Ligand binder design. Sequence first.
Ligand SMILES: C[C@@H](NC(=O)c1cc(-c2sc(C(=O)N[C@H]3C[C@H](C(=O)O)C3)nc2CC2CCCCC2)cc(C2(C)CC2)c1)C(F)(F)F
Length: 227
Amino acid sequence: ASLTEIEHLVQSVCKSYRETCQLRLEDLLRQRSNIFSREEVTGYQRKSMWEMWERCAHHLTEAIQYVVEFAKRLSGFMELCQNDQIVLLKAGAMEVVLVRMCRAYNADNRTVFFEGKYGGMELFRALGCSELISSIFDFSHSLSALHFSEDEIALYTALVLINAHRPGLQEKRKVEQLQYNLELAFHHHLCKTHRQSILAKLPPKGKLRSLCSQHVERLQIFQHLPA
Ligand SMILES: C[C@@H](NC(=O)c1cc(-c2sc(C(=O)N[C@H]3C[C@H](C(=O)O)C3)nc2CC2CCCCC2)cc(C2(C)CC2)c1)C(F)(F)F
């Protein structure tokens, strides 16, 4: 690879994400002024667990379609065989949607954006799974502390999808090579922006799989939808 070409690689990842980011950043930041009234929360709490479950299931799949919408935008994704394309998304999709959640988390009052307005965690009392609902807010809270620049989330997300150290990829060396160019464009931009300091600050391995695996595991037990 070439240096001038790697900088090109960064511009694609940053753009492919900004066009497949679901919600605009300028929207979440400015519309953060209003939140659910205590009335509106009890209405969400009164909802049957199936009610709230049907909600997240849609918003989750919808947020994932943008995740896969992101993958097909990367400049080197299409070349590799379909199987590797399927595997990377299966294990990376749910984790990519987690990193994108902190981007909608307001660390000031612990309120995430869910259906046209910010709200706390008591909004999901109908579900009745505290430790799982809180594992996301606390995680996004830490990630929201670093004050992720949009370009970083795009770069970080790319390395979440790409991962040759995945279950059953076929032509892995095509995944290893690309997984490295992204890390190159990642570190280069970090140093190029004086934010190489975060590398020792991010979640290891690790928290992405363990946190999602707990959710993905509860659905493989109780559900029948996509699984
Ligand atoms: C099974 C288990 N977990 C999930 O169902 C689940 C839901 C979501 C998503 S994605 C999403 C969106 O895209 N919201 C956008 C679209 C909305 C809009 O258009 O306004 C805002 N909303 C949600 C629902 C929110 C529920 C409260 C905790 C934050 C997540 C994300 C995930 C990941 C990424 C962890 C794996 C898991 C469960 F907790 F459900 F039991």
